[PDB]
Amino acid sequence: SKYKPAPLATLPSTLDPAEYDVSPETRRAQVERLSIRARLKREYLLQYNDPKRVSHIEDPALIRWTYARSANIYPNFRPTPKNSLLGAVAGFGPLIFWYYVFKTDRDRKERLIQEGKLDRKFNISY
Amino acid sequence: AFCAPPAYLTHQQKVLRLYKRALRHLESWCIHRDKYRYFACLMRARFEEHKNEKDMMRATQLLREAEEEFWQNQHPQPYIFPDSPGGTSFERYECYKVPEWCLDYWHPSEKAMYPDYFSKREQWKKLRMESWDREVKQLQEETSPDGIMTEALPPARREGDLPPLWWHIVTRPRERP
Amino acid sequence: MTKDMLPGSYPRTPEERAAAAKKYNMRVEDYEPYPDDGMGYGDYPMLPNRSQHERDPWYQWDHSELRMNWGEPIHWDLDMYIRNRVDTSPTPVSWDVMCKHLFGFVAFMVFMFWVGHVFPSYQPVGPKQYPYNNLYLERGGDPTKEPEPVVHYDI
Amino acid sequence: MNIFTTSILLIFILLLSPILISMSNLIKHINFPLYTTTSIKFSFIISLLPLLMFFHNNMEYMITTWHWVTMNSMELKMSFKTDFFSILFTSVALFVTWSIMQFSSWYMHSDPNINRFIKYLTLFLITMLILTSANNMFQLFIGWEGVGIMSFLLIGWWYGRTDANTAALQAILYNRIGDIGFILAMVWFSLNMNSWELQQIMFSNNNDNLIPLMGLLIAATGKSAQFGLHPWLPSAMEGPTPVSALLHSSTMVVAGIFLLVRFHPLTTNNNFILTTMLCLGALTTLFTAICALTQNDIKKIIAFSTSSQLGLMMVTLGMNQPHLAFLHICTHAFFKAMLFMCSGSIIHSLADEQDIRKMGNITKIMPFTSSCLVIGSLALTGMPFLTGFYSKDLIIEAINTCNTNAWALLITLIATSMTAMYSMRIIYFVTMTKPRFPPLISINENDPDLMNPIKRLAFGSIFAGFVISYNIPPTSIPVLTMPWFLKTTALIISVLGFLIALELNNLTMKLSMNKANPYSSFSTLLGFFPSIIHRITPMKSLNLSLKTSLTLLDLIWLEKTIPKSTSTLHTNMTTLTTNQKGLIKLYFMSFLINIILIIILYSINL
Amino acid sequence: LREHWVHILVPAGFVFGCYLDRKDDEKLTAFRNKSMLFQRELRPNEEVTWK
Amino acid sequence: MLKIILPSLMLLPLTWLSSPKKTWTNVTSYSFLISLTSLTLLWQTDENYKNFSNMFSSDPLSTPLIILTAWLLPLMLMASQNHLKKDNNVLQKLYISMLISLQILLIMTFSATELIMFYILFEATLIPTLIIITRWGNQTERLNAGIYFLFYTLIGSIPLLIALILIQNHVGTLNLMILSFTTHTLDASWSNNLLWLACMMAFLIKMPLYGVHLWLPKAHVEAPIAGSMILAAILLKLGSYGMIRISIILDPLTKYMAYPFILLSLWGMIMTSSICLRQTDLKSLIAYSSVSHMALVIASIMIQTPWSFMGATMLMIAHGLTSSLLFCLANSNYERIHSRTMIMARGLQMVFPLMATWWLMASLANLALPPSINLMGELFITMSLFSWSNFTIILMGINIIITGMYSMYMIITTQRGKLTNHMINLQPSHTRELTLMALHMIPLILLTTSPKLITGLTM
Ligand SMILES: CCCCCCCCCCCCO[C@@H]1O[C@H](CO)[C@@H](O[C@H]2O[C@H](CO)[C@@H](O)[C@H](O)[C@H]2O)[C@H](O)[C@H]1O
Ligand SMILES: CCCCCCCCCCCCO[C@@H]1O[C@H](CO)[C@@H](O[C@H]2O[C@H](CO)[C@@H](O)[C@H](O)[C@H]2O)[C@H](O)[C@H]1O
Ligand SMILES: CCCCCCCCCCCCO[C@@H]1O[C@H](CO)[C@@H](O[C@H]2O[C@H](CO)[C@@H](O)[C@H](O)[C@H]2O)[C@H](O)[C@H]1O
Ligand SMILES: CCCCCCCCCCCCO[C@@H]1O[C@H](CO)[C@@H](O[C@H]2O[C@H](CO)[C@@H](O)[C@H](O)[C@H]2O)[C@H](O)[C@H]1O
């Protein structure tokens, strides 16, 4: 019995110990969140229902997200031992691996053509 | 869908919601209506039992225990209404729900085939514009001096006034276009 | 759109934390930057790893498909968590219990297939037999060369 | 050979006139759904003349219509191999599509874009007739990939539904994993045989075709939803029911089985490939039957039925029984298509409800559908002298009397009993209990566009297997000699499966509560294969796409190393050599150093 | 003809270009009817194999 | 070629001397009539290439590229016509002039008979292109994209100029026919290894090769529409055309010197394809799609087999039409919502059903659906790469799977789901926007019926 969570199978809201918290400190957190939520929802509606609108409703939250994930990565990148190793392995790791697969294969192929031990029987296109 | 959720569920709401979930899952296991009726009355016996226990620190401990019991005896595949979230018809017609504003790009030769629908529509676009100013004004007048806010909205308190922010609700596409 | 409405660098002081939270429409006690390992996040909020399948389906979300609200901060990995892709919702069966059961079944079937390879089922019947030297010519054997007489008897 | 050739070629022209009409102004004046249905009907009737001529002569053809291009010494021509398989499949496929096309006019009568839906079904049919009559691998691939796209557009018919779009992309992803296999085989033959034509590939019978045949087995695995690549078939049930009947059961899904029938002359000399088909197929039939035993959606039960019968065709090919595996495809198209039509009739009449828990007592309120729904179940479960007996019975006779994998034999017989257990599940809950649907009853099934297409299949579900079995040439020697228990083995297990089902499904009437167990959770949750593979695998890959590739490499380390360091270096130099104090005193002092260095340089070169 | 004359601009260019290619040929006749492959005797009223 | 070039030089006086209300009609009418004349090059009834003079000459490699260039000029004029409607007259005529100048140079670049003449024309294209991206780009980042584009090219191109001069100082000439019929095997000394990289890095940057490709996603993401169309369709193929032309004089060093670049292409293409899965900008998703297709073109040219060349030539023309069609389609949304974010606008099939058909057909061309020539390229490159070594099928298998995902994910995201109903400015598609897509797609379909025309030199 009992349910063990994981990143790809989160904890149900009804099994969350911190969801039956009722101490006044939490309830005030949950009421400011709604107030922030309702303040925005009110502003979105005051544009959606506006009759003099002639264009779409620009989204600052979406502009920030796309900018955080492109134009803002590099300025906020600092080299460290873990980055540098990760980039070195990520960069040349796969490239060295494949070099030996292909070089090893084609050396076995060039070896077997000098000693004629290959069957290129009907092969006339390459 | 129509009512915006509260800031937090009360104990009373968390127990009713469980009650409904636990019955719908029972009906999923039982299938047969007579068998579903029998166990649904036993289920109510388990909720009437501790109906009055007003400790408020063991009522909670009676809910977390009961949710942890529900999560173990779930149906791995509960019945869902076809139009409900997760249902087989859920959002089936969302590709047929064209917004009303798409008619504002219609060619005149297209608008010439429905002269009387397109005449009962410029009235609605007038009614929308004349009402707008008074709607915005009313929403400030009720902006509570303390920032505490809720997603709900006020009605029209006067005569000749439509409730503020009414166009995206009144004009919404039909559920089955 | 201006520089202070856009993401910036990691917030070092609590005075630049409450500035960052207000940018992103969060409570100061809720704003939480990614850990400062210099991987390029800056001060973008670190939000709980819940896919959009877990959002209230019955609520009338502003961005209906994404199940977001206008203005709300967007998870870094949103495009990995949209409803068309990765789902992190709770399952009726624990994650590891599924993992132990699935591979136990697949592993067991793989074992039992090898067992069936070393103890095959057959019928008490000697090999089929064909005429004309195991049909030597009709299989494309060389007409000029003489096969090896392979013969079968009436019994 | 002109009348045979002309009728073969003429089938395509008939199916292309609905496509041409759809692209002109006429489509807005005529009853386009009826025009396509008449068009396909005439196509089916013409498809019988090539069929009869083959029954008389058994004489196959190879018709090269078009020369497309020459790549030095390798010509690619549009060429059709009108042999046994494509002659008979073409007729069975055109016969089923005549039912589904006419069914759709009743089922999709509300859909505003109905005549786009008709057009897509026609396009699928064309890309299925391209696939089956192809004479070279490249023209196979046109149909192979074409039905792949046409499935995407029909599974995602309701493109506003997010789960339809996910099921459609999921079908594409699994079928591109099987494209690797197809492409692997294609490169191999163009390199070791200089050709893609089936005639030239035949002279590879004495090579070692492991690499090409592994490719084709992977392509067949993905295209026929075999274990490993199987989730996409139950997920494809999002689309409208006419799509489920036509594509994802009686045509598109047999492409992988059809492919390996084409290349049977090569797989007969590979025991590794045969043994893999025998074990890969056996696993598929058991695993999907276990899944089907506890599903509640009507279509997923039927969709899971297909996966299991598809696996059995795969088991057949591992016996080196290619002509039985094909005869099963031809037989299985009839009743399986009907089951979707009979099931799709219920779904329409109950406000698009598909959970069998909200169906009941259908043998009374819907007599006609229930009657055809029980013919389909019994044809499926190998009852004597129905369409499904002239195929299933022989396969079960063969699986017993061949040298084979003991476990593949064992689980394949168990899965044959489960075919009766899960069929009984539908008969029971759908037709036999008490009503469980809502109380406003508006069930109508009097439309000819519903009764007529179902009847055609009903006749096919009864007589078709008999006619097919007696007209095709003798293919292989059946082992007709066996103990009395290996000759009735199929019937007893099927009967036993029913009997076991009755007892089990009649405990649900007891006023005793039902509980979860690990075995039913595994059955109900598809063995957890989707719940894991579709969560862990896309996470790791999509997480690498962002953290490693885009961020760590391109956005960061590839900037830092080349463009950024080059600009840093040169900015560093322009800063050192430009910050001069402007004092002539210091300038001449450097001019003095320069002069001494030239004196020194010239000194050591004397 | 004070706002439509511009339509001789491009057609003139083509004609001028075609003529400029006819000169490039006139300059490269050093092997006319002398290749090992196409050299032949001149027909009665034939002055050049190609122009 | 002087009958394709001189009339094209006349579109410049015609641009300036035409009326304000006739510039766009006149020039776009005569651009079509110039791309018709370029079909004369296709009259190749023999195995001898067309040599028109000492300067220009057309081959089966330079003819498809020449024609694709001439046909693209009228397409780009129509593409640039709605986002330039607010500019005064001299700016439009100055934009039309920069596009014509890029067509004239590109035609001379593919028809040149000598490497030095190729190089100068191959460098001159930076000027009109730098002007286009920077003067008429939209965002502040267009300034950094012009630098990245200008100096990736120039840094690579200086060694090529050195190497070309060494070739002439030794062989006496740079004529491509003479260097073909008098080529001498190179020694494997450490100096010729550098001569090889000198002759190759210029073209490997322009493809671009993986690693040195960051200029392309920067340039595309900020160029005006006609800047992306010419970049993705012709300027990338300057690299491929150069490598084919100059690799004849580099043997046998390509048997070993190519390994590092076959490996960056084969591995690099997987890195770029997987990026398109997580790319938040639609114009950026296409640009990385280009990088991953050119990877195969690089890999196939490095192995110099009749099939590999044949596949690369087909993929060069196929990618030319397909990538341009995608950029035009992404522009059509952008000219409505002025946002490049891919997830911002959704469910557009609901209100643009016909434009959603072109999306589907472009997307199907991108994922190489048979029998389109996009597959013929991918398929013949795979066949050759398999013969080169059998484990390349592992990496090409993966890249084919990823290519399906980001192609359909592109279609599913923007064309399906619910409509983003707040976008009340989604005007009906212009007749101009739809003609632009038909002009991309019809040639692509026609070339599939007659693939012989784009097999290249080997076949
Ligand atoms: C293998 C051969 C390939 C070699 C390729 C070498 C190409 C060289 C490109 C020169 C790039 C010059 O790059 C120049 O400096 C940086 C590079 O980040 C850009 O600057 C950008 O990033 C820097 C961060 O360092 C910020 O300060 C600046 O605000 C921002 O615009 C400049 O706008 C650009 O002009
Ligand atoms: C052998 C030659 C090969 C290399 C070719 C030359 C390429 C050019 C590289 C050197 C020039 C680039 O120089 C780059 O200029 C940018 C311009 O933003 C500087 O960046 C600067 O941006 C702005 C304005 O300039 C300033 O407000 C900022 O403080 C500063 O960072 C970078 O610090 C420097 O790296
Ligand atoms: C190899 C190809 C040939 C390359 C040719 C190079 C062309 C010149 C490129 C540099 C740009 C010329 O610079 C361009 O000048 C024109 C007028 O001269 C300006 O034109 C604009 O501004 C000026 C006043 O500000 C007005 O007179 C003019 O009518 C208006 O359109 C452009 O804003 C500017 O971009
Ligand atoms: C980062 C930029 C890289 C620069 C790349 C430039 C390309 C490299 C060119 C190959 C290297 C130089 O190639 C050089 O050619 C010259 C003549 O041309 C020859 O070198 C030799 O030339 C002649 C004999 O031929 C001798 O009298 C002379 O003493 C010596 O220099 C060798 O062949 C090689 O040393």
Coordinates of N, CA and C in Angstrom, one line a residue, chain C residues 109 113, chain D residues 226-227 276-288 308 311-312 314-316 399 405 407-412 415:
Chain C
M109 N 8.9 -13.2 -20.0 CA 8.6 -13.8 -21.3 C 9.8 -14.0 -22.1
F113 N 10.8 -17.8 -23.5 CA 11.0 -18.0 -24.9 C 12.3 -18.8 -25.2
Chain D
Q226 N 3.1 -4.5 -33.5 CA 3.6 -5.7 -32.8 C 4.3 -5.2 -31.5
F227 N 4.4 -6.2 -30.6 CA 4.9 -5.8 -29.3 C 6.3 -5.1 -29.4
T276 N 12.1 -15.3 -35.0 CA 11.8 -14.0 -34.4 C 10.3 -13.6 -34.6
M277 N 9.9 -13.8 -35.9 CA 8.5 -13.6 -36.2 C 7.6 -14.5 -35.3
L278 N 8.1 -15.7 -35.0 CA 7.2 -16.7 -34.2 C 7.2 -16.2 -32.8
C279 N 8.2 -15.7 -32.2 CA 8.2 -15.2 -30.9 C 7.7 -13.8 -30.7
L280 N 8.1 -12.9 -31.7 CA 7.5 -11.6 -31.6 C 6.0 -11.6 -31.8
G281 N 5.5 -12.4 -32.8 CA 4.1 -12.5 -33.0 C 3.4 -13.2 -31.8
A282 N 3.9 -14.2 -31.2 CA 3.3 -14.9 -30.1 C 3.1 -13.9 -28.9
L283 N 4.2 -13.2 -28.7 CA 4.1 -12.2 -27.5 C 3.0 -11.2 -27.8
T284 N 2.8 -10.7 -29.0 CA 1.8 -9.7 -29.3 C 0.4 -10.3 -29.1
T285 N 0.1 -11.5 -29.5 CA -1.2 -12.0 -29.4 C -1.6 -12.2 -28.0
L286 N -0.7 -12.7 -27.1 CA -1.1 -12.9 -25.7 C -1.2 -11.5 -25.0
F287 N -0.2 -10.6 -25.2 CA -0.2 -9.4 -24.5 C -1.4 -8.5 -24.7
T288 N -1.8 -8.4 -26.0 CA -2.9 -7.6 -26.3 C -4.2 -8.2 -25.9
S308 N -4.2 -8.5 -31.4 CA -4.0 -9.9 -31.1 C -4.1 -10.8 -32.4
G311 N -0.9 -10.3 -34.3 CA 0.2 -11.0 -33.8 C 0.1 -12.5 -34.3
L312 N -1.1 -13.0 -34.4 CA -1.3 -14.4 -34.8 C -0.9 -14.6 -36.3
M314 N 1.4 -12.9 -37.6 CA 2.8 -12.9 -37.4 C 3.4 -14.3 -37.0
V315 N 2.7 -14.9 -36.1 CA 3.0 -16.3 -35.7 C 3.0 -17.2 -36.8
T316 N 2.0 -17.0 -37.7 CA 1.9 -17.8 -38.9 C 3.1 -17.7 -39.8
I399 N 0.0 -24.6 -36.1 CA 0.9 -24.2 -35.0 C 1.2 -25.4 -34.1
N405 N 8.6 -23.1 -31.2 CA 8.9 -22.7 -29.9 C 7.8 -23.2 -28.9
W407 N 7.0 -22.4 -25.9 CA 6.3 -21.3 -25.2 C 5.4 -20.5 -26.2
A408 N 5.9 -20.3 -27.4 CA 5.1 -19.6 -28.4 C 3.9 -20.4 -28.7
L409 N 4.0 -21.7 -28.8 CA 2.8 -22.5 -29.0 C 1.9 -22.3 -27.8
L410 N 2.4 -22.4 -26.6 CA 1.6 -22.4 -25.4 C 0.8 -21.1 -25.3
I411 N 1.5 -20.0 -25.3 CA 0.8 -18.7 -25.1 C -0.1 -18.4 -26.3
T412 N 0.2 -18.9 -27.5 CA -0.7 -18.6 -28.6 C -2.0 -19.4 -28.5
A415 N -3.9 -17.4 -25.8 CA -4.5 -16.2 -26.4 C -5.6 -16.5 -27.3

